[PDB]
Structure formats: C-alpha cells, structure tokens
Design a protein around this nucleic acid. Structure first.
Ligand SMILES: [Mn+2]
Ligand SMILES: [Mn+2]
Ligand SMILES: [Mn+2]
Ligand SMILES: [Mn+2]
Lengths: 455, 455
DNA sequence: GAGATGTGTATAAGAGACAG
DNA sequence: CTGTCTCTTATACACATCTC
DNA sequence: GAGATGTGTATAAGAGACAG
DNA sequence: CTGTCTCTTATACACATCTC
C-alpha cells in the first residue's frame, strides 16, 4: 500500500491498446510518476531521471499513441471496478480546457472568435456508487474543438448527451441497468430523455424549459404544484464570497433553507413519453434572496417521500463532476501544460484526467475502522509520530478517522469553518508530505538495518 | 545548522523596536515559520498550531506594529553583516506590489486611473559584497502610494533616489566609503549624481539622456567615441523566448557579442560636476538585432582596461535586485497575500521582503569546499542516501559542489540548457524536500534510539 | 525474415514565464 | 532592462523490441 | 501602582478562489 | 449551477506581560 501510484497506474492503463506493448508500458510508467507527483511538471516527476524525462516527452509526442485509446483504457478499468456495486451514478457534464500559448491558434473556439484563449470542449461521464457515493472512475469522455463558424461543425454539440449515452451503454453492457445518469439543466432535451427511455435506461435530469403535460394540460411546474405535499427537508446553505456581474463583492450569508417537496407523473408531447417528476421549492425565502427550487425529471420512482428524497439526494451529487473538473485543472494541472501541438497536449491532459480522479479518490479513501486498513505499519507509525500531540479526543487512538485528520493536519487543515471536512487539496498536501517524510523515515531505517551511524 | 529559519529570524528581527518586547518576539516567530514554509500561507506555516495562526494574524493586524520598524530592523542586521567586507555594492531600484481584491481601492495607483489593479510603489536598496558578490541583505526600502492625481503627490517620485541615498548614508555611517551604488537609466538625474559627489559617495549609474561635456563641447557618447579603445570583452547572450508589442512570439537566438570599450572624464554643466564615464559598444551586430551598448557614469576610476572592466562588471550585477523582486513575489508570495487592510498587507509583505532575500542567499550558500561546512552530519548523510547513484564524476564525493547538484536534483534540476546553474527556485524546492525528508529521517532515529520497531 | 519503433545517452535549442 | 532559467522538442547512435 | 496589550483557547463569519 | 472549502478578521475570557 506504499507506492500506490505505481500499482495504480498499472491497474488503470495496463490494458491500453496503444498498438505496441512498449507504448502501453511507457504509458504506465508516465502515469505512475505523474500520479506520484500530482500537479507537477513531467521533469520533476522524473526524479532526475534523464531516460525517464525523455521517455515521457517521447510518449506524449509519439504519433502512434491514440489519446482515445488511452482514455478508453482508463474507462475499462472503471467498468471493471463497477462490477461490485448494486447501484451506480453516472454524473454527466461538460467543461472546457483553455490555453493561451501558440498552440491555441490550432485549437477550437471557447468564446469570442477574437478571444486569445482557445482550447477544447470536453464532455465527461464520471461513475460513482449510489450507496456510499464513492468515485469509481471516468466512464467516458468526448473531446472536440468548436469551429469559429458554426456552419462548419460536423454535428450539433447538443447531441453530446446522446453520444455519452451511446458509449456508456456499450462499455457498461449488462450493468447499464444498475446505472442512473445525472445531468444538469442543459440536458433538458426531449431527444435525450426519449432515447434513455427507449433503452429502459435510468436517469435524473434537471428541468430548464417550461414543458406541458399531456393530461394535466399544464406546465410541469404548475402540474406538480397541485400534487399533495409529500413532505420536505432542510439544507444548510454555507456562507461564501460572491462576485456580481458588475465585478464588485457581495456576501452570501449562511442560512438553513426549508423545502417543500411534491411528486407525480408527467407526459410530454413528443414521442408521447411518460416519466415521473419531482418539484422541490424553498420555504419562506429571505427578502434579498431568490426562492430556491428544483424540478427534476426522472425514471426513478417517487411515489413516497422517501422515494422522492432519493431523487433529490442522487441529483445532489451531480456536483461531483464539478470537483472533478477543478481536480483536472488546479489539481493535476491540465491547463498548466505547455505542449506545443494539439495531439501532444491531448495525450498529456488525457492521462491527467485519471490522475485527477485519484486525488478525489484519495480523500475518499480516508473518509468513512482502523488506520492499518489503508495505511501500512511503517507510514501509520510515522504519521503517529508526526501527529503527536495534535489529535482531538473526538478521534480514536489509531482509527481511520484519526489518520484523516492527521494527514489533513499535515496539509494545513485548520478547520476554519469548523465543518470537519477537509478539501481534497489539503488532504493531498498531507499525503504528499507524509510520503515525502516516509522517504527519510525509511532511509534512516535502511541504513541502521545495515549498521551505520545515523546521529 | 538545522532549523536555520528559527535562528535566522532571530538574527534579523531581534532588534525590532516594535515598542513592546512581546511584539518583537511574535515578529521573530512569525518570520521563522514563514521562512520555514517559504511562499506558503500563514496557516500552513502554523503547523496545525492554533495559538500560532492566531498569533500571526494578530500581529500583522496589530495597530501597534510599525511596518517601518520591522523593515528598519532587518536593515540594521544588514549593516552589521556588512562590517566584514572591504567593498560593498548597493543595488538600487524600484518595483510595484499589485493587488486586485477590495483592499486595492485603498491603495495607490499603478497604472491607469481606471485600472482595477492597484497597490504600492517600492524603492529598495539591496546590499552585496563587491568581492564574491554575495547578497548581504536589504539596506533600505521606501514604500508609497501614488495618488490618482499627481497634483496631490506630497513629493516627486524622482527624489526617491536621493531619499535612498540619505537613509543609506545614515545607517551605513563610516562604511559608506566602502559602498558603491548601482542604478539603471532612470537614475540619470544630475540632482542625484550631484548629491553623491557632494558626499564623496561612490556610484555607478547608466546613462539615459544625452548630456554634454564642458570641455569636449560634445555629447557624452560622441566624446567617448574619440577616446582610445581600451580594449574590450565578450558576453554570451543566452537564447530565450520573447513577446513582441503585438503580443505574438519571437525567438531570441543565442550569440556571443564582442564589445569595444573606452573610457574618459566628463563634466556636466549643472554644479559643474566632474566624473569618469565608460562607453561599451557591441561589435558587428546581427542584421536583425540592435547594437548592444552601455554608457555608464561613475566615480570609480577607469583609466585602465582593468579599471573599466571593473565598472562594467559591477553594473552587470545590478540585475540582482531584479531577482530579488521575483523572489519577493513569485517566491515569498508578496502578491499572493490577501490581507483586507493596507497596514495589514504592508506588515505581512514587509516581513516577506526579508523572507525573499533568504531564498537568494540560500542558493548562494551552496555556491562557491566540503558539504560538512554548511550541512549537518545528519542531513549530509541523508542527502547522500537520497542522491545515491545520480552524481556526475565531475563533482567530488562529498563536496560543497556535490550538495549543490544533489539538493538541486531534488528540486528537479535537469540542467536543460546545460549551464550548470540552477534557479534559486529549484534549489529551494530541493532544500525544502531534503528538510521535509529529514523529518522522517530524524523521526525513525528518535524512535529507534528509545527502542521501537520501525519495520 | 525484413523493416520499423522504442530505450538510454548525448547534444542543441525554441517556447514560456516572470521581472524588467 | 544588456535577464535567468525551466518546459518541450528534435536529432543521432547502438541496441533492444515489435509489427506485418 | 493603575491601566493597557499580548497569549491561548473558543466561537463565528466575511472575503477569496476556482468551477459552475 | 442548489458549490466547497481556505484565507483573514473579530470578539470574549482568564491570565500573563508591559508601559507610563
Ligand atoms: Mn453544463
Ligand atoms: Mn527602474
Ligand atoms: Mn527593475
Ligand atoms: Mn459544469
């Protein structure tokens, strides 16, 4: 359980069909060093190793390596791990990778045709287990450049959703039935909803456009407001800093929001498709605040306050893909790379997508047992030494809850908002520190184990 | 020689007259943690220490702490260290500290009155020893905000140079005679040159404006072109990436530049002051390249090709203050701080000026003996373990030249341009890594020294 | 089998970045 | 303002690996 | 001497940042 | 798009330190 990075890389890319085993091999080593030195330049991850550095750069530049094949490999590993869960969540969303150095000119449009910043549009599908909600891994990804003139686009971007569904359906095979897609408003596309339904595929999409109900003859919102109040729930909206359109600074104070919840069956005109819907609307919202609300369409049953709370709960996790994105950028450093050719940059950033998931997964592994479960006796001992006189009586002596706060404490976590949760980023610094320290801890050991004055 | 940070902070700020010993004390601890965690947030530097974090923030916010007094303290330490060198270089230049968060509005103007980015203008005087050219430390600093309307400025910014000279003359006292000021073109101000001369103060300033010579009746450049060619020298201009006004990308290839050198005495109209001058002009410059040239005014003698090469050499180091600036920002993170009040931000960034010099000094300490001279036996051993099988036959077994490349190699240095020199930044990562590892190395030791299974 | 493609070592140098 | 390096890309040689 | 100012611990929350 | 935390700032209490 030490140099996980190395074992990790192997389990993820060992099946990579790069057309040549040597390529597949190099892929696994490149990944391992990147994973070990998360968010660091290839150079640093090489550990002064010229043959390594040269091996890496040669790989992301090798005209024989399909960035798709790489991505494909990582996905297959996800399918494999998926085989052990009863219910899976497939978060689906899009993000952009933006660059401003020479290679930008050969990249697609992200904003205004005159905008210097250009890059790629990526549509990913991150898998989770609907039980404890842990990140299984990346199931699919679609990369594409947006032309300056839409009249040149080979296809409408909106079809991405149907694209994702297609590949997802192909890779997960008989496990699709255990999958529940989760997408934001932009997914409100009857051509999508129709598809999923045609395949008995489960899903949970948020409503954007006002639609009508065949029977009710009303707008979904108006038809659901009539259904009996199944009950409700509450959420604590945390305080944060905000930035208005003007560019100034507005504060969003904390406040507990009470919500009313309803549910029912709707039917849309096109394809005359039928499904259930849920409408969650805030309760007595503050004067200077917009009344919180959600209206989700889905195949999942919602006849009971519990079955509906399940839908609200599932959709609440869609935000995981947002954290994935931050991990892919600020984390693994996708937008920090400076390759000078499209294919090259794609090859690097493609590997980093997986090196981005791992950061998430790392924090989750230390989140609910004992430390000996994930940590090795050596590092577990060192962490204990380092964390000496810093643990709260709230945590056991050597529990999986202690290691969390100990590793996190290395990362600098001071629980400023006293919430207990530490950012995956602070938990990573800790892991990185602990491991770094483990080098010296194991070094002193190796020398004393062969007889040598260490002080 | 271990937790230098701690001893360091003490030697620099222990004399700080913050009006209360407790304040002075806190100052030293705050510095020590910042120095230990260079370029990191106060939080991280606190090592999970609530009483520390709270102590730091309380300090940079304490209405009783004069940011000047802090700076003053660090300067006095410089004067002290200066006492051991025959000849000192006082590089003088200005830089700006720019911020874009709310506190900006209360800060001075850096650009256009409408510009969001605002902050401070700082005029520093960094001391060096004219022999080996090591960084002694910060001798003076002037902080000031530029008003939106120049009609409100209490004084002309141009007088800063005379300001710096005044304080420098006051703190260095009888050691001013061993000092040589070094300033770029913007210092071409007869009111300055006149001052220094009036105080028998030495200096080396680059020429900007065309001036005439009382005798020669010519322009300095034209009067020096007549003097006999004292000889010359060569310099290797290193390849780099450049950015044109248009914003594109132009390459500046490497090339050895041959220069012709002359010298003579000039005399300006105002105050009818007299001094020596040196004119170094390139030789057979490339078609698409501007003919390199320097014309420096100074009190230092230049009658011989050696005495003149000394002036060219001295002025060549003025660029050290440019590295200081990068160290103050990208390094210590001056522009990364987010204090919400002017005085507060000043107090933090003021401390960081010194925590910025140390990064420079650190790289210099490992630059030309043996490692045992700077490194402790413990860390020296660990570095050797870590650097096992990575040293070139070019470096001794355990020399002060080996540690350099070993520590640097930890930092990732791969000598891409094969120049041998490593950035102070890469040498810092190494030092940081080594020390981090030293924690585990010393931990395993402490436990085995008391009998405990370490594997 | 005959002809590429990757590995380690070396040598050079364009692109980038941050500070002028 | 005479910059200082680090990140990326190639090329070449002697072998070691693979593909068609 | 009488009256502040800093230290450690605790409790809360506005500002910032990066991704929507 | 129902965000998630980390960086900065205060306040209060019981003492420990300092200043005028
Ligand atoms: Mn979206
Ligand atoms: Mn200047
Ligand atoms: Mn400058
Ligand atoms: Mn999104």
């Amino acid at each position: 359980a030490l140099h996980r990075a190395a074992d990790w890389a192997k389990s993820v890319f060992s099946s990579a069909a790069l057309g040549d085993p040597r390529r597949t091999a190099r892929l696994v080593n490149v990944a391992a060093q990147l994973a070990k030195y998360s968010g660091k330049s290839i150079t640093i991850s090489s550990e002064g190793s010229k043959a390594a550095q040269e091996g890496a750069y040669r790989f992301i530049r090798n005209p024989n390596v399909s960035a798709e094949a790489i991505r494909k490999a990582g996905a297959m590993q996800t399918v494999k791990l998926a085989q052990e869960f009863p219910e899976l969540l497939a978060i689906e969303d899009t993000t952009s990778l933006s660059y401003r150095h020479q290679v930008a000119e050969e990249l697609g449009k992200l904003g205004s045709i005159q905008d210097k910043s250009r890059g790629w549009w990526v549509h990913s599908v991150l898998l989770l287990e609907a039980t404890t909600f842990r990140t299984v891994g990346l199931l699919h990804q679609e990369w594409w450049m947006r032309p300056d003139d839409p009249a040149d686009a080979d296809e409408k971007e909106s079809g991405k959703w149907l694209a994702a569904a297609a590949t997802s359906r192909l890779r997960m095979g008989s496990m699709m039935s255990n999958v529940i897609a989760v997408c934001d408003r932009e997914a409100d596309i009857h051509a999508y909803l129709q598809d999923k339904l045609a395949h008995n595929e489960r899903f949970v999409v948020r409503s954007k456009h006002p639609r009508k109900d065949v029977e009710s003859g009303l707008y979904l919102y108006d038809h659901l407001k009539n259904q009996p109040e199944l009950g409700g729930y509450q959420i604590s909206i945390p305080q944060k800093g905000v930035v208005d359109k003007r560019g100034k600074r507005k504060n969003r104070p904390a406040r507990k929001a009470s919500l009313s919840l309803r549910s029912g069956r709707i039917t849309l005109k096109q394809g005359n498709i039928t499904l259930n819907a849920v409408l969650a609307e805030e309760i007595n919202p503050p004067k200077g605040e917009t009344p919180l609300k959600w209206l989700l369409l889905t195949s999942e049953p919602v006849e009971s306050l519990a079955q509906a709370l399940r839908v609200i709960d599932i959709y609440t996790h869609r935000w995981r893909i947002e954290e994935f994105h931050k991990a892919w950028k600020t984390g693994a450093g996708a937008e920090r790379q400076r390759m000078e050719k499209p294919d090259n940059l794609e090859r690097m950033v493609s590997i980093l997508s997986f090196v981005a998931v791992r950061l998430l997964q790392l924090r989750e592994s230390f989140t609910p047992q004992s430390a000996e479960t994930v940590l090795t006796p050596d590092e577990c001992q060192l962490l204990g030494y380092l964390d000496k006189g810093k643990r709260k009586r709230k945590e056991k002596a050597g529990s999986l809850q202690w290691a969390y706060m100990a590793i996190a404490r290395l990362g600098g976590f001071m629980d400023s908002k006293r919430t207990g949760i530490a950012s995956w980023g602070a938990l990573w610094e800790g892991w990185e520190a602990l491991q770094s320290k483990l080098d010296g801890f194991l070094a002193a050991k190796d020398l004393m184990a062969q007889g040598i004055k260490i002080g």
